[PDB]
Design a protein around this ligand. Structure first.
Ligand SMILES: C[C@H]1CNCCN1S(=O)(=O)c1cccc2cnccc12
Lengths: 20, 353
């Protein structure tokens, strides 16, 4: 499912800006 | 047509009144922009309580003003670290913007000052924490709940764009919830005052507009793209474009394809298809009708824009607040000392601060 794909992306936490 | 006489005249009058409001707001902003306030407090006016947030920028601490007892959020930047990270201009600009703007959903800079080692921005303390936490905890927001927040961002961007400010840093991590449940926008390091186009690759992968990814010159329409991302994530619980790695995210963003949860209303999908429009000639917020295409969209038909601006709408969610100084909506961080050297560091660089 899309939700499962989101969990699997590893990007569920706070996301940094590109410059970081 | 879609409106009879009464509704059409009411809408027209409302849209004219916005113009009048924004004209006055620009005059007020330009006065403060051109003569910024400086040096309105000092460090020993405050007791440092707890770190609320951290980053490469430095940290933000909850502080208490000794005389008044009022709590504030104090952003502390190490002048030498800012220089090393090539962030002098961004740091000066952030403070200059913050002391010049005035809007109910933009955090207020109550004091600022510097010492031999550090720069300090003392902002109002917004005790509800980041939208991000609430979103991840609750899972997703109902469409009315998402709309209440979205309406505040629409008005805030309407205000900022009228000042020729592009925001460029929209995401749930960067939106705080205040004690009445309303939004506060705090971070302005990536904001830029430009009338036309600009070219810097900056932002967060999931929220980047295609024209940024594609290394084009771009304009304030990237903020309306990012609003579409935010509304989608608030209502779905996950963003429209995600993947293991940013390069894969960018591929999806530029592809022109987006998919929606089955629980999204048709009105919401229509709005999002018009905000998440890769073709700049077709993106809402970038057309002849400007912000009106968004504000007059069916998904916002129940939104009383003036009532939102006046903060007379009952928020759908009030964060827990066990009294002033309460930090339960923030994370726990390791507490470092605040060292102030006997020797001024990077003086010339930060004259304007
Ligand atoms: C991570 C940093 C910078 N990004 C926005 C959120 N924050 S912050 O939560 O510390 C944060 C930043 C600015 C003002 C604040 C006011 N009240 C509470 C917290 C505040």
């Amino acid at each position: 499912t899309t939700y499962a794909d989101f969990i699997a992306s590893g990007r569920t936490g706070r996301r940094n800006a590109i410059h970081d | 047509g879609h409106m009879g006489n009464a509704a059409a005249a009411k809408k027209g009058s409302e849209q004219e009144s916005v113009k009048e409001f924004l004209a006055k707001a620009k005059e007020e902003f330009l006065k403060k922009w051109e003569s910024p306030s400086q040096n309105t407090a000092q460090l020993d006016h405050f007791d440092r309580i707890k770190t609320l947030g951290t980053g490469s920028f430095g940290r933000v601490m909850l502080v208490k003003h000794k005389e008044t007892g009022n709590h504030y959020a104090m952003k502390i930047l190490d002048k030498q670290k800012v220089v090393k990270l090539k962030q002098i201009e961004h740091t000066l600009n952030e403070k200059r913007i913050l002391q010049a703007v005035n809007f109910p959903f933009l955090v207020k800079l109550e004091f600022s000052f510097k010492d031999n080692s550090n720069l300090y921005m003392v902002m109002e303390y917004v005790p509800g924490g980041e939208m991000f936490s609430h979103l991840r905890r609750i899972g997703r927001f109902s469409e009315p709940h998402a709309r209440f927040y979205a309406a505040q961002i629409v008005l805030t961007f309407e205000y900022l764009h009228s000042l020729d400010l592009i925001y460029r840093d929209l995401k749930p991590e960067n939106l705080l919830i205040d004690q009445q449940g309303y939004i506060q926008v705090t971070d302005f390091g990536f904001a830029k005052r430009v009338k036309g186009r600009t070219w810097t690759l900056c932002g967060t992968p999931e929220y980047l507009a295609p024209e940024i990814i594609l290394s084009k010159g771009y304009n304030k329409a990237v903020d309306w793209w990012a609003l579409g991302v935010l509304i989608y994530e608030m209502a779905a619980g996950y963003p429209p474009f995600f993947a293991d790695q940013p390069i894969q995210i960018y591929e999806k963003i530029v592809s022109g394809k987006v998919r929606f949860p089955s629980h999204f209303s048709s009105d919401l999908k229509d709005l999002l298809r018009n905000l998440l429009q890769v073709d700049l000639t077709k993106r809402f917020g970038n057309l002849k009708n400007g912000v009106n295409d968004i504000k007059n969209h069916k998904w916002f038909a129940t939104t009383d824009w003036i009532a939102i601006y006046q903060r007379k709408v009952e928020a759908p969610f009030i964060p827990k607040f066990k009294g002033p100084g309460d930090t339960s909506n923030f994370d726990d961080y390791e507490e470092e000392e605040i060292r102030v050297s006997i020797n001024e560091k990077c003086g010339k660089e930060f004259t304007e601060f």
